[PDB]
Amino acid sequence: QRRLYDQAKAALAKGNSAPYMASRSALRDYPLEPYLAYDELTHRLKSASNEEVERFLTEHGDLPQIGWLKLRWLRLLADRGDWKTFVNYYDPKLNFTELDCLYGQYQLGHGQKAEGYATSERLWLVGKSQPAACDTLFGLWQGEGQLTEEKVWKRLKLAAEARNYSLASHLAQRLPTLGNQGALMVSVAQNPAQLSQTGRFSQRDHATADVVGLGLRRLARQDPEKALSLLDYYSSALPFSSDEKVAIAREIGLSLAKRFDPRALPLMTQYDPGLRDNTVTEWRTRLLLRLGRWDEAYALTRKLPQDLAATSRWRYWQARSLQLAQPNSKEPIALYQKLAGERDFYGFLAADRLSVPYKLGNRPAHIDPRVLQRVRNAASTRRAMEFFNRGEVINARREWYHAARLFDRDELIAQARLAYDMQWYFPAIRSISQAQYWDDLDIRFPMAHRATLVREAKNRGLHSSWIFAITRQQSAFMSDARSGVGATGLMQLMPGTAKETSRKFGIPLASTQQLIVPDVNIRLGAAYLSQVHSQFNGNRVLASAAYNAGPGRVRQWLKDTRHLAFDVWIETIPFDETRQYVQNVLSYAVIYGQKLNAPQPIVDWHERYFDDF
Length: 613
Description:
613 residues; Methyltransferase, Methionine Synthase (B12-binding Domains), Chain A, domain 1; two-stranded antiparallel sheet
């Protein structure tokens, strides 16, 4: 009929299961019933039989939350010493370190000594604190003389790299001979500038080298110039392995290169001449492009390994570096023509360099309805469908992601289309993306919140395509999206920025929790957008970057320039996030330009060259 399941759900959270038992067989057919079964079993888990739990795991092993039952149940199996059953259900792919440490204890108590050692070492060499279950394991492992001073030293080094200094220190008080260098590693990790006192760190042993090597790699982040100076000294003074040296040169080189210091080039060249490190290789090339050294850039683009060379990034820059080095050569038009077909930032630049139309080619997928029917009738779908109609966004979203976890390519696309048809845009975007079917531009770039975006764009003299592109990159139309560091909503406003932006523009805000309202979020998003637009003279390349990284960052990336090309500037952005972000926004603006029937070239005329001059 139509289900008052909330009676039973209210009974179970908290206390009593009597309504669920009464109701149960009316809900034989209802899809969310097994969430009730789940809690009913979970509250009495400590006294449920094996055969009952095992049976629940077979019948409902498709539930998003089934892993938590396995964790709670396997704790009991270990306490009770019922290892036969523990091992039948312990799954490493749950990623529960409590369980992995429990499985280590099994290994050691049941003959598998080599494997238990290896398990213990694998969980010991971690720079953060581990569960209590692992203390028991590390106790046992130690009691078979495997916990050597070398390994407590190695974990100490990981902990200092993780900046977990209370852990790092506990470990330093456990070094029977190296306790000096342990204390010295923690000092240096906290302030690596102390390495200027070279007399204090010249004790010629491997432990001292470990402290100096860490110190130099950390110092390289904020003072790469000082660290470059000190490298020369310390490499003579101390027994660095060849790999320990290249690891230091890597950080010093990368940090110098991101400040556009040409002293990075000889260092990078000497410590990675094989072009083994992709990141060193890309920034070596980027630094050359910044300095106008086109020939060297070009030579370098020709040496790249297969996996870099195959990218659109370095196909482009091979072509453009040649065009810059040899303006009169025609080898670059061949290279651009092969690339101009790709629907991607670099492919658009290639098409822009040839003055030829961009290639979009919207081509939605041939789907078998026998596949569509199967995915529409899957238990996980039926449940997710029902959570959507109930208002529970997060539960429906949880069900959706988790079913997709094991769907093949055909099924994922079927899933994608089902979500599009509901106007449920972010999950369609998400599913089609993990399907890697990129040609369906209707699903990938839908016109969601069009009224509200097109309105607040005209409001502030901004192009519709550009606001469409920002919110697509920032949220992908998840109205309640939240980032790792607390940026909130469709245009990922930062609580601190939202506060400023509210105050300035006379747009009222109740709270950070109100950033989830589309109409609120877009007003003060599009406000802050026009501000940074105006701060950089209508330059969407600069203005975009500012939106993601702060105008003071963008100002720093503009000193001291003179007639810098826009593509070289974008390519040489120090932050990987902000570089990718800018590239995506500019690309998405092209595409939403076509879909809004207000064409947008990859860059405007006035954006092509800029400087702080």
